[PDB]
Amino acid sequence: SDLKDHRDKWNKYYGVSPDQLSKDLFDKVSPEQIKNSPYQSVGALFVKGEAVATGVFIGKNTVVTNHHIAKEAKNNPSKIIFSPGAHADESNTGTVLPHGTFEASEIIDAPFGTGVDISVIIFKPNAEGKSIGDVIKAADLGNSNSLKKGDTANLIGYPYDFDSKNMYRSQVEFQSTDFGLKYYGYTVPGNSGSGIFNSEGKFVGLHIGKAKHINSQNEINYAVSFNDFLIRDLKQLIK
């Protein structure tokens, strides 16, 4: 059955302890790798007192994350802090913030309406007058429609529940790509807002969380899928 198939695919990511997953399925991003694309567009988001998540920098002071995260700031931008390329020091004692932190200027909660789980956050330049785009490169946006069932891609973000400091790459395999993206892969709640990057390094969707799949007792990952309308809006925003 479809259930047996689903359980076998899900068991590949959830049937062993996560510290036992092979590096091909789930791997810590090293400080060397974090300096390159596509890793370098990704950062940790902290909503003071409310939530942890991942954000992806798209240009021109602008970061995307999920609406389910950003709304918890209640339109109070000073509560949202982003640190691009945050990682643990060699001892796991502290988080190294290679580019420091940025504090939000403006939150736009539901720019694509309430049915699309993405928010746009505009950040203040830091104390040096430096924008995010002055220290890292923007993600390279692309459409979701080149993805299909059975394709693999890379989910990149901060799986806080597993490791509170480091960025990780989770391999994902698509189950379907019409009802947004649905896929198998190892994720935890912190991964809210993780980028989905295709084999060419394009940013082609935004991880949300887990949705019911097949019936009420089973689930799968799902993401915001980037269509032509959404892509065009974000390109005009960063012009």
Q: Which CA distances in Å does 214 have to 105, 133, 150, 192, 219? A: 41, 42, 18, 22, 8
Kindly list the catalytic residues. Answer: 68, 117, 192
Domains of the chain by residue range: 2-31+140-227, 42-138
- 224 burial type by CB count under 10 A (0-12 exposed, 13-18 middle, 19+ buried): buried
The closest of 49, 84, 48 to 63, measured between CA atoms, is: 84
Given a contact cutoff of 8 angstroms between Cβ atoms, the answer to whether 193 and 145 are in contact is no
- C-alpha 35 chain-centroid distance: 17
Exposure on the CB side of residue 106, measured as CA atoms within 13 A: 8
* Count of Cβ atoms closer than 10 Å to residue 161 Cβ: 13
Non-local CB neighbours of 16 within 8 Å, separated by 6+ positions: none
Given a contact cutoff of 8 angstroms between Cβ atoms, the answer to whether 114 and 58 are in contact is no
How far apart CA 166 and CA 148 sit, in angstroms, is 29
State the resolution, in angstroms: 1.6
* 42-138: CATH architecture: Beta Barrel (2.40)
Both structure tokens of 10: 């899900």
Which residue has tokens 């974090």? 34
* Count of Cβ atoms closer than 10 Å to residue 148 Cβ: 10
> Is the fold of 2-31+140-227 the same as that of 42-138?
yes
Both structure tokens of 221: 């990952």
Phi/psi at 20 (5° precision): -110, -5
The count of residues in the chain is: 239
Classify residue 67 as left (phi > 0), alpha (psi -120 to 50) or beta.
alpha
- 127 burial type by CB count under 10 A (0-12 exposed, 13-18 middle, 19+ buried): exposed
CATH of domain 2-31+140-227: 2.40.10.10
- C-alpha 164 chain-centroid distance: 15
Q: Which CA distances in Å does 43 have to 39, 101, 195? A: 9, 10, 10
How far apart CA 114 and CA 70 sit, in angstroms, is 13
Q: Name the DSSP class of 34.
A: G
Both structure tokens of 119: 């928010």
Name the pairing type of β-strands 152-157 and 195-197.
antiparallel
How far apart CA 114 and CA 191 sit, in angstroms, is 21
The amino acid that residue 134 corresponds to is: D
